[PDB]
């Protein structure tokens, strides 16, 4: 019975409670599942091309505002006139502009040079950055075929090529596929084969952040197991500078003097940043490296502000408060905010007042206010993804970056509260009892205000074990071109010469699991970091020394062929058995299958090399009754080893006695059947 | 407690069941709640306004 239903009811109470404990953690993962930053890829103003080089721009306080690009064929002579109202002229005399957005690798993807010429530089910088953000995550970019992986890339329509009405000479039908923000999310999903939702957001100076908010939703609801979010503003023609000049809003120097009294305009910059978003449960279950965690992102509009361009105060507060409420975090839980900091003399005051309202009203410690645009410039639709890059790197390095051109804090902002500390000096941000949290704000010119909360990656990665092994795992690297093959060994050699002490097995695992099998492959089995960087120094020039090189287009399945007699030496299985645990196991298995019918156990005979196999009227394995069983014993074991290391035969071929091995390894006969 | 052997734990089961019902309905109100089309505005070819 049930103590008169006492057990019964309680037994039902133990299920309605356990179901409630499971139906409430489902809501908590449907609305507030912490989504992680698996990997980070960026092309930002200056020399920045990787997230680690971008930290070499924030930590040493370098400004990326250098000057206008000359690669793009910009006129540069009608761009500047003494008259500020002359049509066709720009006001900023510089800004951080990408020096590599003009160039692209067409042959790497399935893109023709004719097609790639018409591809928007915004779009051609999301295919390479899609490849980078996947290789940095340890996820082979070609492994994500027909998989749910949504793409959320934010752009601005802008203008790259000629008028679509007039067409072109060489580029006629691919002008469309270039100058369309739509395909700027579908092209990435097509080249990488991603089946996940390909949304191309458009939200002016907040596009990227907004995109991540959407992506966050995708992972929280579960539409896409992987999210691919970020934004870009690549600047192909000087038109956009010419016309923000018409509102007299660009800083003549092109510098984003965020929260500064010398703010004479919001300036401009062109750049790109990209993120790989995955829910923390999926990211850690699949082993994907977690760099930081987005907890909550909110997106709102300025409403009826003082025009479409002017920002709104209360709406900005309502988005930096909603993100906290949606993330389950608060004003005191954020240690350092990354505000928009567009740089105009009007946006910054109201923007700082909003920060002083949601955060500064209730602060235990001074909030470390920063702005990535100070070091870079206003990257427009790439702002919001550059800001999250700044916070995560500040989190991974334990240091808060400087806000350049912020020594003279703005006189129009009341800093007397002290709850907000402008980051004019590098403030240490060490890991402690409080989980490190940050906030990135982007307020676009369209009026859409967005804010995201970035918690530090939960420090559960610690606890890894250490060991040593004799397995010289091959250092496999592949490229789409011979020159790229010679460049993927030079960059790796530089990385293993500028980041020394990285274990060889760790390097092989990342090079093998994390790099796509591209149709120009070079592979070698290193024994030391000096015998490897020497091979990596010969592979960079093209000399195949101690390595294997081969172009292998349209090739993915091995056949195992089985030679007959001819290796009369028979002195190699000893070294393989002593160093391979399987070769001391599978060889034992086949020998123990040969013994019931042929009493000769191979292992005592194997340790007898050819040097000790010629005394008692014998030669190097010439006894047919003795050579054939020991030929087979090594023969089946070796085929098991290629299958134990992951190579399966597509076909089997047996010259004379390989037919016996065809019986065993192909499943036609068992080990006992084949050995007999 | 007093009558038979369940009048306090049964209240807890009742509350837990109601909480599960109000929490599973929340799941279906967060991923499967019908979304009504309040009105349509359209500008289409052929003079459609």
């Amino acid at each position: 019975m049930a103590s008169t239903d006492s057990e019964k009811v309680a037994e039902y109470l133990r299920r309605a409670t356990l179901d409630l404990r499971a139906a409430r953690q489902r809501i908590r993962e449907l609305e507030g599942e912490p989504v992680a930053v698996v990997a980070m890829a960026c092309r930002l103003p200056g020399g920045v091309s990787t997230p680690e080089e971008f930290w070499e721009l924030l930590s040493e306080g370098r400004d990326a505002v250098a000057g206008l690009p000359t690669d793009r064929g910009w006129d540069l002579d009608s761009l500047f006139h003494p008259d500020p109202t002359r049509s066709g002229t720009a006001h900023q005399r510089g800004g951080g502009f990408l020096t590599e957005a003009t160039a692209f690798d067409p042959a790497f993807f399935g893109m023709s040079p004719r097609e790639a010429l018409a591809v928007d530089p915004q779009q051609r910088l999301m295919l390479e950055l899609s490849w980078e953000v996947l290789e940095r995550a340890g996820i082979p970019p070609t492994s994500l075929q027909a998989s749910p992986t949504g793409v959320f890339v934010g752009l601005i329509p802008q203008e790259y090529g000629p008028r679509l009405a007039e067409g072109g000479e060489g580029v006629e039908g691919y002008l469309m596929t270039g100058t369309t923000t739509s395909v700027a999310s579908g092209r990435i999903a097509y080249t990488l084969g991603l089946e996940g939702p390909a949304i191309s957001v458009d939200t002016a100076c907040s596009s990227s952040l907004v995109a991540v908010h959407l992506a966050c939703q995708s992972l929280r609801r579960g539409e896409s197991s992987l999210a691919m979010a970020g934004g870009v503003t690549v600047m192909p023609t000087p038109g956009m500078l010419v016309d923000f000049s018409r509102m007299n809003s660009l800083a003549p120097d092109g510098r984003c003097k965020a929260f500064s009294a010398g703010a004479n305009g919001f300036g401009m910059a062109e750049g790109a940043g990209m993120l790989l978003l995955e829910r923390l449960s999926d990211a850690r279950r699949n082993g994907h490296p977690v760099l930081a965690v987005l907890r909550g992102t909110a997106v709102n509009s300025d409403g009826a502000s003082n025009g479409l361009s002017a920002p709104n105060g209360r709406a900005q507060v309502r988005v930096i408060q909603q993100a906290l409420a949606e993330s389950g975090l608060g004003p005191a839980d954020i240690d350092a905010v990354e505000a928009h900091g567009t740089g105009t003399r009007l946006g910054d005051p109201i923007e700082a007042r909003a920060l002083f309202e949601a955060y500064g009203r209730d602060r235990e410690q001074p909030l470390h206010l920063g702005s990535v645009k100070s070091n870079l410039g206003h990257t427009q639709a790439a702002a919001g993804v550059a800001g999250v890059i700044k916070m995560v790197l500040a989190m991974r390095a334990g240091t808060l970056p400087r806000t350049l051109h912020a020594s003279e804090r703005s006189k129009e902002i009341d800093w007397s509260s002290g709850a907000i500390s402008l980051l004019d000096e590098p403030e240490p941000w060490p890991a402690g009892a409080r989980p490190r949290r940050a906030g990135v704000s982007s307020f676009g010119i369209s009026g859409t205000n967005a804010h995201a909360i970035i918690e530090e990656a939960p420090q559960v990665v610690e606890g890894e074990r250490v060991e040593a092994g004799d397995v010289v795992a091959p250092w496999v690297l592949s490229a789409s071109s011979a020159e790229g093959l010679r460049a993927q060994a030079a960059r790796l050699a530089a990385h293993l010469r500028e980041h020394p002490g990285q274990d060889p097995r760790d390097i092989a695992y990342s090079l093998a699991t994390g790099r796509a099998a591209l149709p120009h492959r070079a592979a070698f089995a290193p024994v030391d970091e000096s015998a490897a960087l020497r091979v990596l120094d010969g592979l960079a020039t093209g000399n195949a020394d101690g390595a294997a090189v081969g172009t292998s287009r349209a090739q993915q399945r091995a056949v195992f062929v089985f030679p007959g007699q001819g290796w009369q030496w028979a002195g190699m299985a000893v070294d393989l058995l002593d160093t391979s645990p399987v070769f001391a196991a599978a060889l034992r298995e086949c020998a123990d299958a040969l013994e019931p019918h042929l009493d000769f156990e191979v292992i005592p005979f194997l340790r007898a090399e050819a040097a000790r196999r010629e005394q008692d009227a014998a030669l190097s394995t010439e006894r047919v009754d003795v050579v054939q069983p020991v030929m087979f014993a090594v023969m089946v074991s070796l085929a098991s080893m290629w299958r134990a290391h992951g190579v399966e035969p597509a076909a089997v071929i047996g010259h004379s006695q390989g037919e016996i091995a065809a019986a065993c390894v192909a499943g036609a006969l068992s080990l006992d059947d084949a050995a007999r | 407690m007093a009558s038979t052997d369940s009048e306090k734990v049964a209240e807890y089961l009742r509350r837990a069941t109601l909480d599960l019902r109000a929490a599973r309905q929340r799941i279906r109100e967060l991923e499967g709640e019908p979304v009504a089309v309040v009105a349509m505005a359209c500008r289409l070819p052929g003079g459609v306004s």
Partner: antibody
Amino acid sequence: EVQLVQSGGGLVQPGRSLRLSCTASGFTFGDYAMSWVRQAPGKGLEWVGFIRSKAYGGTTEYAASVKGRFTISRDDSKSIAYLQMNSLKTEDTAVYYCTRGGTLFDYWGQGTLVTVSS
Amino acid sequence: DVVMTQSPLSLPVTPGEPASISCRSSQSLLHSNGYNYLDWYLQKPGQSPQLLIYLGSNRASGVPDRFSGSGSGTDFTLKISRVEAEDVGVYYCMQSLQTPRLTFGPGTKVDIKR
């Protein structure tokens, strides 16, 4: 949805009867055991009593200070819970509450300011 | 005997700050069913009390997840994750094991901390 709005406040002298009704709407009245709570002004709550569900049957258990004075009844067809006050005295000057359970007061009526002053 | 249930009866808590209220139970409220039999009640000043957490840890529906809960065999802890300008009132540590329920306890004066 659930509401347990009350009614029956007023001003009385020590020694007369008063009415307290608990309006039930939104649920099956016969499932839960209706209970009654008394809150002294500005200080600690004190529990009065409850009636068990008619499916349970049981009895009507009251607090030690209201033996022989207060009685509690219930009905499904008209869905009102009763707290009958008889031989009232000074301590009864408090805001009474109607709670949705004998051991689990999950719901809580808004409160009727019952005053017994001379 | 009657189990003596007593909490730190004062909790100065300030908005945006995590607090933690515990409770004494002289006897063991961990019943044989494996579930604690203690209730967490909040009497809102000028409004009716509210069911926050039942069975020691299980939160009720309607109230925010702020009120998280747990405890040992005797020692209990309502982990209010965070307090706001609304989170200020009287918290009652009510044992629901030996009916009658006359005493709700003196109650905890939860106050805006300054």
